[PDB]
Amino acid sequence: LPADPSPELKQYAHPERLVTADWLASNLGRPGLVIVESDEDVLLYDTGHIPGAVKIDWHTDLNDPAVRDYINGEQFAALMDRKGVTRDDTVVIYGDKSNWWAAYAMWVFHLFGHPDVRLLDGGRDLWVSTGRDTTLEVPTRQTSGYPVVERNDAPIRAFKDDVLRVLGKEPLIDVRSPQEYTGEREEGALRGGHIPTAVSVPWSKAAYDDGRFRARAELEEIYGFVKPDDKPIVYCRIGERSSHTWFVLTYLLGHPNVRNYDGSWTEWGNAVRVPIVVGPEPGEAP
Amino acid sequence: LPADPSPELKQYAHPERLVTADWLASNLGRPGLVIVESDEDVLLYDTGHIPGAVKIDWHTDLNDPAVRDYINGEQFAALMDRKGVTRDDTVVIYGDKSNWWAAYAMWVFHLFGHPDVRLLDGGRDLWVSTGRDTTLEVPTRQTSGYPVVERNDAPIRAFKDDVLRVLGKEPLIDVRSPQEYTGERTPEEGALRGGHIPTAVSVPWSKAAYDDGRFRARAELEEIYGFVKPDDKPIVYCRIGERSSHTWFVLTYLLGHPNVRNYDGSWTEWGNAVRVPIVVGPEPGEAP
Numbered sequence: 001l002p003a004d005p006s007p008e009l010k011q012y013a014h015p016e017r018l019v020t021a022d023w024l025a026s027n028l029g030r031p032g033l034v035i036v037e038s039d040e041d042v043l044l045y046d047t048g049h050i051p052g053a054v055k056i057d058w059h060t061d062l063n064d065p066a067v068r069d070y071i072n073g074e075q076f077a078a079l080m081d082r083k084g085v086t087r088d089d090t091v092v093i094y095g096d097k098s099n100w101w102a103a104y105a106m107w108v109f110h111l112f113g114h115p116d117v118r119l120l121d122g123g124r125d126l127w128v129s130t131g132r133d134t135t136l137e138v139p140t141r142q143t144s145g146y147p148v149v150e151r152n153d154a155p156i157r158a159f160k161d162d163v164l165r166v167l168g169k170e171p172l173i174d175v176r177s178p179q180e181y182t183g184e185r186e187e188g189a190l191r192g193g194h195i196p197t198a199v200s201v202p203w204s205k206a207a208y209d210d211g212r213f214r215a216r217a218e219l220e221e222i223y224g225f226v227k228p229d230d231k232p233i234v235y236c237r238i239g240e241r242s243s244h245t246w247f248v249l250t251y252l253l254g255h256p257n258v259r260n261y262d263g264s265w266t267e268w269g270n271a272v273r274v275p276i277v278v279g280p281e282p283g284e285a286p
Numbered sequence: 287l288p289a290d291p292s293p294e295l296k297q298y299a300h301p302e303r304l305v306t307a308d309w310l311a312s313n314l315g316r317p318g319l320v321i322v323e324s325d326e327d328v329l330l331y332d333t334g335h336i337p338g339a340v341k342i343d344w345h346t347d348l349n350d351p352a353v354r355d356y357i358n359g360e361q362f363a364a365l366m367d368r369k370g371v372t373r374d375d376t377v378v379i380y381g382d383k384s385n386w387w388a389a390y391a392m393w394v395f396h397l398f399g400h401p402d403v404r405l406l407d408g409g410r411d412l413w414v415s416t417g418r419d420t421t422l423e424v425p426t427r428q429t430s431g432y433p434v435v436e437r438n439d440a441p442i443r444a445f446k447d448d449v450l451r452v453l454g455k456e457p458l459i460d461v462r463s464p465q466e467y468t469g470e471r472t473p474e475e476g477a478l479r480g481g482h483i484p485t486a487v488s489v490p491w492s493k494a495a496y497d498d499g500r501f502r503a504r505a506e507l508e509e510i511y512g513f514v515k516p517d518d519k520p521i522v523y524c525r526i527g528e529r530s531s532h533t534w535f536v537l538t539y540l541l542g543h544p545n546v547r548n549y550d551g552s553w554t555e556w557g558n559a560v561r562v563p564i565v566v567g568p569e570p571g572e573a574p
Contacts, residue, residue, distance in 0.1 A: 068479050069561050159560060188474040190526075190554060191354050238478075263560045266478060270558040272354050272445065272551045 001032055001090040001116070009121075011216040013254025017247075018213075019092055019118050021127060028052060034085050037124065038105040039095045048134035050094070050127060054083050058101055058240075062108050070151070076112050077146040084141035087115070094120035094127070098211045100203075104243040107260060110156055112149050119247070125211040156246070158233050158259040160267060167197055167275075168285030171225070171232045174198040175241045176265070183278045187237055189269030193278040195235070197285055199225070203241040206248045219253060226255060235261040287318050287376040287402070295407075297504040299542030303535075304407050304501075305378055311418065314338060320371050323410070324381045324391040334420035336380070336413065340369050344387060344528065348394055359435045362398050366432035370425070373401070373433060380406035380413070384495040390531040393548060397437050405535070411499035442534070444521050444547040446555060449483065453563075454573030457513070457520045458486040461530050462553070469566045475525045477557030481566040483523070485573055487513075491524070494536045501540060511536070514543060523549040 003016035004023040012018070027033060028051055035053040037045050045055045056062070061079055064071060071079070085091060091114065095102040102119055109117045120127070128134070163172070174194050179185040181200045183192035194200075205222050206214055226232055232249065234242040239262035249255045268274060277283030290309040295301035313319060314337060321339040323331050331341045342348070347365055348356060357365070371377060377400065381388035385405055395403050406413075414420065449458075460482050465471040467488045469480030482488075493510055494502055501507075514520055520537065524530040527550025537546045556562060565571030 066479070066481065066566055067561065067564050068557075068559065186473065186476040186478075188476055190474060191352070193352065266558050267560055270354070270554050272555055274353070276353050278352050 001027075001030075012252045014251045017118050017251040018121050020121055021130070021132065024050075024092065024120060025132065032089055034083070034089045034091050036083075036091060036093045036105065037095055038093055038101045039124070040097050040101055044096055044124075046136070048128075048136060051133060051135045051137070052139060053094075054139055056083070056105055058104060058108075062105070070108060070111065073112065073149045073151055076151075077148050080146035081144050082142065084139070084143045085146065086143055087147060090116045090118065092118050092120055094123045096124050098125065098207050098244070099123040100240045100244055103247045104240045107156065107243045107246060111151050111153065113152065122210060122212045129210070156259055158261040160261075160263055160271075162259070163195065163233060163261055166231075166233070167195075171230050172198045173201055173232055173234050173245065175201060175203040175234060175236050175245045177202055178280075180237075180265075182280050187266060189265055191269045191276055193269075193276045194282075195268060196275050196277045196283045198235075198277075199282055201245075203236070203244050206245070213248070213252060216252070219248065223249065223253060228255075230255075231257040231259070233259050233261050235264045237265050238262070239264050287313075287316070298540045300539040303404055303539040305404050306407055307412060307416070307418065310336075310378065310406060318375055320369075320375050320377050322369075322377060322379045322391065324379055324387045325383075325410070326387050327382065330382060330410075332422070334414075334422060337419060337421050337423070338425055339380075340425055342369070342391055344390070348391075356394060356397065356437070359398065359437055362437075363432040363434050367430055368428065370427040370429045371432065372429050376402045376404065378404050378406055380409045382410045384411065384492065384499045384501075384532075385409040386491075386532055387528065389535045390528045393442065393527075393531040393534060396442055397439065398435055399438060407501060408499040415498065441545075442547060443527075444549040446549075446551055446559075448547070449521060449549055452519075452521070453483075454485055457518050458483055459520060459522045459533065460486040460488055461491040461522060461524045461533050462488075463490055464488060466525075466553070468568050472557075475554055477553055479557050479564055481557075481564040482570075483556060484563050484565045484571045486523075486565075487570055489533070491530070491532050494533065501536065504540070507536065507540060511541060514541075516543075518543070519545045519547075521547050521549050523552045525553050526550070527552055 004019045006020045009015040009018055035050055036056055037049050037053050038056050042057050062070060093102045093105050099119060106117050172195060174181050181194050234245045236242045239260055242260050246258055246260050249258045275286050289302035290305045292306050295304055321336055322342055323335050323339045324342045328343050379388045379391050388405055392403050460467050467482050472480040522530045522533045527548050530548055534546055534548050537543045563574045
């Protein structure tokens, strides 16, 4: 399955990681293609979805049931088999909330090295608002033999001690709302504020009101502070909005070495004796 | 100011760390004595309190405004001055809920080495239910000169790394409800995972009190806590350290066990940390 050749995507650094709605409509039902809906709301898929699409739920399908961590390689293989995905298939992921959870699912697939994963520009919001076909029908396809791979965290994931070591030496980007960043505002925390030196670029700035990713030129200016030799870290409350910003910096802008700090404010704002800055200014390193 | 000589206190290992309601009523307004009310509900004091009592407010008075930690020596000294407490005064602390937040205030005073601190047996509940005198009048007494001391954490406080080093070597006591202990129940105090620390045992904190607010008799407490041995070095925890201070007091002063530590991080730290060991269900489980 070749890349979507639509002219409007060529403006980006790695255009092959996106597909348009008209491309997807003409390719529905084709062999070697699997379509995946991934939403914040676990109930939404059952109200209607793109024909042939399967469902993945981030909470029940992608997390360990006991410790705060993702599933392992043996468990990822079993999930692919149950969903009818082979190692050789093109996977296209889409969902509600401007593709926040679709980007998170794509980030998790990258931990297991799935070769060809792409997002639908505009996601579920645009598909539905433009009046395109949906169905209640749930697919029955099942496959077997997805390979058992060792999970590879280092290239795309940062832990709490990785963050402490680079304070003052690399760009740290907080993607929450302005009121969260200053400390004015299940997911609560005992302290409010941001990590010392962090800069505020809310995930919003990268998307239009209809859910599509913004034009290259608009992106170049929001994120132009990031220099070519930089190794940036992104974060939020639990790591979904930071997933959206990871995709933007990596594939649309072509910046290598971006890591997602998944622990995020739920870890940091609850830990005893870690440094915190309150108010609208970034602050100094410790 | 001598210890309360009432015979009902002699059953305990260190009876001088308690006073009775009769002793307190007999000594109200005496020189060298300061009375402190400490409650989870910060508005409760203003609805009525013991005559001459001052208020400590756990949010604004005892916590750093920016990081998750308590105040320092300089800030403790300034607070003592505003409240009218000198280094040589006897301090008696009391509050609602069988003294839940009163024991936490006492634990904080111990970080700074204040020489004579005591709790009122029965707390606010027993004072009111037995029809004793209360008032709305706020004292205006102030003092100056409390000494600046370096805060001393190590003897009574445990951090996350201290807990990991002793799993399967020392008793770990989880004082939350049974449903929180199993992970059935999971709110600025919520958590992304449910369960308990590996090897921990369940003892809900209110087992140590009667329904009138007083601490139980020594015989009843030895049935509940007898599994703790003379050579043990125990750690206690809950959701936040403020809520497991009550059990620290019981173990230390009523039963005479030295070397008990409070893990203040508690479930709000541990249940939100990335990649730490957790056991789900009703059994303690093994060390990793």
